[PDB]
Symmetry: C15
Subunit: 82 residues, 15 copies
C-alpha cells in the first residue's frame, strides 16, 4: 500500500480528467444528435447522408473525453511517479 | 480496515467522477431525445429512422459517463495505491 | 463507532455523487418529456411512437444518476477501506 | 451525545444529498409540466394521452431526488460509521 | 445548552436542506403555472383539465422541497447524534 | 447571554434558510404572475378562471419559502441545542 | 456593549437575510409588472382586472422578502442569544 | 474608538445589505419601466393607466432595497451590541 | 493614523456599498432607457409621455444606488465606531 | 511611506469601487445607445428627440459609476483614517 | 526600493481597476457599435446622425474605464501612502 | 516511488490540461456538426461540400484539445523536473 | 535580481491587467464586426460608411484594453516600488 | 530530481496556459464553422468563397491557443528559472 | 536554478495572461467570422468587401491576445526582477 501526496493527487486527477472531460463533449453530442434527428424528420430521404456525417462528428467529440480517460488510466495503472 | 489521505481522496475522487461526469451527457441526452419525439410527431412515418439514429447518439453520450463509472469502480474495487 | 477522515469523506462523497449526479439528467429528462407532450398534442395519433421513444430516452438518463446511486451505496455498505 | 467529524459530515452530507439533488429534477418537472398543460390547451381531446405520458416522466425525475433522500435517510437512521 | 461541531453542522445543514432545496421547485412551478394561466386564456373551456394536471405537477414539485424539510425536521427534532 | 459555535451557526443558518429560500419562489411567482396578467389582457372574459389558478400556484410557491421561515424560527425561538 | 462571535454573526446574518432575500422577489416583481403594463397597453379596457391580479401577485412576492426582514429584526432587536 | 470584531462585522454587514439588496430590484424596476414605455408608445391614450400601475410596481420594488437600507441604518445608528 | 480592523473593514465596506450597489440599477436604467428611445422612434408624437414616464423610473433606480452611496459616506465621514 | 492594514484595504477598496462599479453602467449604456442608433435609422426624423432622451439616460447611468470614483478619490485624497 | 503590504496591494489594485474596469464598457461599446452599423446599412442616408449619436455614446462608456485608469495611475505615480 | 510537490502538481496539471481543454472544442464541434446535419437535410445535394468543410473545422477544433493531451503526455512521460 | 512580495504581486498584477482587460473588449469587437459584415452583405453599396464607423468603434474598444497593457508595462519596466 | 516551488508552479502554469487558452477559440471556431456549413447549404455555388474565408478565420483563432501552447512549451523545455 | 516566490509567480502569471487573454477574442473572432460567412452566402458578389472588413476586424481582436503574449514573453525572457 502507498499513501503520499502524489498517490492522492493522482486519484483526484484521474477523476477530474474524465468528470470535467465529459462536460463539453457531453453537451456537444446532444446538440448534433438533436439536429440530425430533426433533419431526419425533415428529409427522410436524406437519412443515410445525415447518419453518416453525425457519426463522423460523434467520433471527434468522444475522442476528446477519451484523452481524459487515457490520462486517468496512466495515473492509476501506468503511474510514472507512484 | 485502512485510513489515510489517499483513501480519503479515493472516495471523493470516486463521487466526483461519476457525479460531475453526468452533467454534460445528461443535458445532451435530453436535447437529443426532445428533438427526436418532436421529430416523430412531425413525421410519424419516419419513427424508425429517428429511433435508430437516436439510439446511436444516446450510446456515445452514455459511454462518456461510463468512463467516469469505470474510474470510480477502479478507485473502489481495484485501487492501485490503497 | 469509528470516525477517521475516510468515514467523513465517505459520507460527503456519497451525498455529492447522488446529488450532483442528478442535475444534468434531471434537467435533460424534463427537456425530453416537454417535447414529448408538445408532440402528443400536435399528433395524438403518434402518441405510442412518441411514448415509446421517450420511455427509452428516460431510461438512458435515469442510468446516469443510478451510477451515482451505486457509488453511494458501495461507499455506505461495501466500503473498501473503512 | 457523540460529536466526532463523521457525525458532523453526516448531517451536512444528508442535507447536501437532497438540497442539491432537487435542483435538477425541480427545473425538469416544471419544464415538462408546463409543456403538458400548454399542449392540453391547444389540444384538449388529447388530455388523457398528455396527462398520462406526463405522469410517467414525472415519476422518473422524482426518483432522481428520492435517491438523494434515500442516502440522507441512511446517513441518518442507518449510519454505517457513527 | 450543548454545543459541538455536530450541533453546529446540524443547524447549518437544516437550513441548507430547506433553503437550497427551494431553488429548483420554485422555478419549476412558476414555469408550469405560467403555462397554465396562458393556456387557460387560450382555451378557457379547458380550464378544468388544465387546472387538474397543473395541480398534479405542483404536487410532484412540492414534494421535492418537502424532502428537504423532512431532513431539516429530523436534524432538529430527532437528531440521531446529538 | 450565550455565545458558542452553535448559537453563531444558528443565526447564520436562520438567515440563509430564508435568503436562499426565497430565490426560486421569488423568480417562480414573477413568472406565473406575468403570464396571468398577459392572459387576462388576452381573454378578459377568462379572468376569474385565471385569477383562480394563479392563486393556487402562488400558494404552492410561497409554501417553499415558508419552510425556510419555519426552520429559521425553530432556530431562534425553539432551538433544540442552544 | 457586547462583542463575541455570536454577535458578529448576528449582524452578518441580518444583512444576508434582507440582502440575499431580495434578489428573487425583486426580479420576479419586475417581470410581473412589465407584463401588466404591456397588458394594459394592449387592452386598456382591462386595466382594473390587471391592476387587481397584479396587486395580488406583488403581495405574495413582497411577503417573501418580508420574511427575511423579520429574521433580521429579531436578530437585531429580539436576539435569543445575545 | 472601539474596534472589536462586531464593529468590523457591522460595517461590512451594512454595506452588503444595501449593495446586494439593490441587485434584484434594480434589474426588476428596469424590466417594468421598459415595458411601460414600449407600452406608452403603442397606446399613448393608455399613458395614465400604464403610468399609474408602473408607479405602484416601482414602489413595491423600491421597498425591497429599503429594507436593506433600514438594516444598514440600525447597524450604524441603533446597533444593538456595539 | 489609526489602523485597526474596523477602519480597514470600513474602507472596503464603503467601496462594496457602491461598487455592487450599482450593478443592478446600472443594467436596469439601460434596459428602461433603451426601450424608451426605441418607443420614441416608433411613435415620436409620444416623446413627452415616454420621456416623462422614463425620467420617473430613472429616479427610482438611481436611488437604489444612492443608498449605497449614503452608507459609504457615513462609513467615511460620520463613522460610528472609528 | 506609512503601511498598515487600513492603507492596504484603502488602495484595494479604491480600485474595486471604480472597477466593479463600471460593469452595470457599461452594459446598460451600450444597451440604451444600441437602441438609439437603431431608432435613429428607423426614423431619422426623430433623431433630435432620440438623441435628447439618450443623453438623459447616459447621464443617469454615468452618475452611478461616478459615485464609485467619488469614494475612490475620498479614500485616496481625503482618507479619514490614514 | 519599497516592499510592504501597501505597495503590493497598490499594484494589484491598479491592475484590477482597469481589468475589471473594461468589462462592462467593453461589452457595452460592442453592442452600440453593432447596432449603428446595422442601422447604417438600413438607412445609409442616416449615417451622419447615427455616427454622431454613436460617438456621444462611445464617449460616456470609455469614460467609465478611464476612471479606473485614473485610479491606477494615482496608485503607481501619485500614491498617497507609499 | 518518488513523491514531492512537483510530482503532485504534475499529475493534477496533466488532468486539468486534457480535462478543461475539452470544454471549448466539445461545445464548438457539436455546434458545427449540428449545423452540418441540418444543412445536409436542407440541401442533400450539397452533402459532399458540407461534409468536406465540416471535417476541416473538426480537425482545427480537435487540434486545440490535442495540445492539452500533448502537455499531459510530456508531464507524464517526459517530465523535465521529475 | 530582486524578490519580495511586491515584485511577486507586480508580475501577477501585470498578467491580470492584460488578461482580464481583454475579456470585454474582445467580445465587444466580435459583436461590432459581425454586424458590420452582415451589414455589408445586406447593402454592399454602403461598405465604406460601415467600414468607417466600424474603425471608429474598434479603436475605442481596443483602447480599453490598451489601458491594461499600459499598466502592465509600467509594472514591469517602470515600477515605482521595485 | 529537483522539486522546488517554481517547478511545481511551472507544470500547473503550463497546463493552465493551454487548458484555459482553448475555451475561447474552441467555442469560436464551432460558431464560425457552423455558420460556414449552413451557408454552404443555402448557397452551394459559394462553397469556395465560404470555405476560403472560413479557413482564414480558423487560423486566427487557432493561433490564440498556439500562444498558450508556446508558453507551455517554454515553461517545460526552455524554462528560464528551473 | 533559482526558485523564489517571484519565479513561481512569474510562471503562473505568464500562463494566466495568455490563457485568460484568449477567451474574449477567441469568442469574438468566431462571432465575426460566423456573420462573414453567412454574409458571403447571402451576397457572394460582396465577398471581397466582406472578406476585407473581416480581415481587419480579426487583426484588432488578435492584438488583444498578443498583448498577453507580450507580457508572458517579458516575464519569461525579459523579467525585470528575477
Ligand atoms: O509528513 C511526512 C510526509 O510528508 C510528505 O508528504 C506529506 C506532506 O508533507 C503533507 O503536507 C501532506 O498533507 C497535505 C494535504 C494536502 C491535501 C491535498 C488537497 C488537494 C490535492 C490533494 C490533497 O501529506 C503528505 C503525506 O505524504 C511525504 O510525501 C511523505 O513521504 C512523508 O512521510
Ligand atoms: O504530519 C503527520 C503525518 O501525516 C501524514 O499523513 C497525513 C497528512 O500529512 C495530512 O495532511 C492529512 O490531513 C489533511 C486533511 C486534508 C483533507 C483532504 C482534503 C481534500 C481531499 C480529501 C480530504 O492526514 C494524513 C493521514 O495519513 C503521514 O501520516 C505522515 O507521513 C506524517 O508524519
Ligand atoms: O481517528 C484518528 C485518525 O486520524 C486521521 O485523520 C485525521 C486527520 O489527520 C486530520 O487532518 C483530520 O482533520 C482534517 C479536517 C479536514 C476536513 C474534511 C474535508 C473533506 C470532507 C471531510 C472533512 O481529522 C482526522 C481525524 O481522524 C486518519 O485518517 C486515521 O488513520 C486516524 O485513525
Ligand atoms: O470537547 C468538547 C467538544 O468539542 C469537539 O468539537 C470541537 C472541535 O474539536 C473543533 O474542531 C471545533 O472547531 C472547528 C471549527 C469548524 C467550523 C465549522 C465547519 C463546518 C460546519 C460549520 C462550522 O470546535 C468544537 C468545539 O466547539 C467535539 O466535536 C465534541 O465531541 C466535544 O465534546
Ligand atoms: O484530532 C482530534 C479528533 O479528530 C477527529 O475529529 C476532529 C477533527 O480532527 C477536526 O479536524 C475537526 O475540526 C475540523 C473542522 C472540520 C470541518 C468539516 C467540514 C465539512 C464536514 C463537517 C466539518 O474536529 C473534530 C472533533 O472531533 C476525531 O474526533 C478523532 O480522531 C479525534 O478525537
Ligand atoms: O475555545 C473555547 C470554546 O470552544 C468551543 O467552541 C469554540 C471553538 O473551539 C472555536 O473553534 C470557535 O471558533 C471557530 C470559528 C468558526 C467561524 C464559523 C464560520 C462559519 C460558521 C459560523 C462561524 O469558537 C467557539 C466558541 O465557543 C465551545 O463551544 C466553548 O464552550 C468553549 O468555551
Ligand atoms: O480561543 C479563545 C477564546 O475564543 C472564544 O471565542 C472566540 C472564538 O474562539 C474565535 O474563533 C473568534 O474569532 C474567529 C473569527 C472568525 C470571523 C467570523 C467568520 C464568519 C462570521 C463572522 C466573523 O472570536 C471569539 C470571541 O468570542 C471564547 O472567547 C473562549 O471560549 C475561547 O477560549
Ligand atoms: O478588541 C479585542 C476584541 O477581540 C475580539 O475580536 C477579535 C477576534 O478574537 C479575532 O479573531 C479577530 O480576528 C479575526 C479576523 C476575521 C476577519 C473578519 C471577517 C468578517 C468581516 C470582518 C473581519 O480580531 C478581533 C479583534 O478585536 C472580540 O470581538 C472582542 O470582544 C474583544 O474586545
Ligand atoms: O503595528 C504596525 C501596524 O500593524 C497593524 O497591521 C498589521 C496587522 O496586525 C496584520 O494582521 C496585517 O496582516 C494581515 C494580512 C491581511 C491581508 C489583507 C486582507 C484584506 C485587505 C488586503 C489584504 O499586517 C499589518 C502590518 O502591515 C495595524 O493595522 C497598524 O495600526 C499598526 O500600526
Ligand atoms: O489582535 C490584535 C488587534 O486585533 C484587532 O485588529 C487586528 C485583527 O485582530 C487582525 O485579525 C487583523 O488582521 C487579520 C486580517 C483581516 C482581514 C480583513 C478582511 C475584510 C475586512 C478588512 C480586513 O489585523 C488587525 C490589526 O489591528 C484590533 O486592532 C485590536 O483588538 C488588537 O490590537
Ligand atoms: O513582517 C514585518 C513587516 O510587517 C508589515 O507588513 C507585513 C505583514 O506583517 C505581513 O502579514 C504581510 O504578509 C501578508 C501576505 C498577504 C498577501 C496579500 C494577498 C492579497 C492582497 C495583496 C497581498 O507582509 C507584510 C510585509 O511588509 C510591515 O508593513 C513591514 O514594514 C514589516 O517589516
Ligand atoms: O515575516 C518575515 C518577513 O516577511 C516579510 O515579507 C514576507 C511577507 O511577510 C510574507 O507574507 C510573504 O509570503 C506570503 C506569500 C503570499 C503569496 C502571494 C499571494 C498573492 C500575491 C502573490 C503571492 O513573503 C514576504 C517576503 O518579502 C519581510 O521580509 C519582513 O518584514 C518580515 O519579517
Ligand atoms: O524533502 C522532501 C521533498 O519535500 C518538498 O515538498 C514538500 C513541501 O515542502 C510541502 O510544502 C508540501 O506540502 C504542501 C501542500 C500543497 C498542496 C498542493 C497544492 C497545489 C498542487 C496540489 C496540492 O509537501 C512536500 C512533501 O511531500 C520538496 O518539494 C521536494 O523537493 C523535497 O525533496
Ligand atoms: O521554505 C522552504 C523552501 O521554500 C521554497 O519552496 C517551498 C515553498 O516555500 C512552500 O510554500 C511550498 O509549499 C506551499 C504550497 C505551494 C502551493 C502552490 C500553489 C500553486 C503553485 C504550485 C503549488 O513548498 C516548497 C518546497 O520547496 C523553495 O524550495 C526554497 O526557497 C525553500 O527550500
Ligand atoms: O528562496 C528563498 C526566498 O523566500 C521568499 O519567498 C518565499 C516566501 O517567503 C514563502 O511565503 C513562499 O511560500 C508561500 C506560498 C504561496 C504560493 C504562491 C501563490 C501564487 C503563485 C505562486 C505560489 O515561499 C517562498 C520560497 O522562496 C522570497 O521570495 C525570496 O526573496 C527568498 O530568496
Amino acid at each position: 500500500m502507498e499513501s503520499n501526496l502524489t498517490t492522492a493527487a493522482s486519484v483526484i486527477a484521474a477523476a477530474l480528467a474524465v468528470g470535467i472531460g465529459s462536460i463539453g463533449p457531453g453537451l456537444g453530442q446532444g446538440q448534433a444528435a438533436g439536429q440530425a434527428v430533426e433533419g431526419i424528420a425533415r428529409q427522410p430521404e436524406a437519412e443515410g447522408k445525415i447518419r453518416g456525417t453525425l457519426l463522423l462528428s460523434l467520433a471527434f467529440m468522444e475522442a476528446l473525453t477519451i484523452y481524459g480517460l487515457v490520462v486517468a488510466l496512466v495515473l492509476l495503472f501506468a503511474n510514472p511517479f507512484v
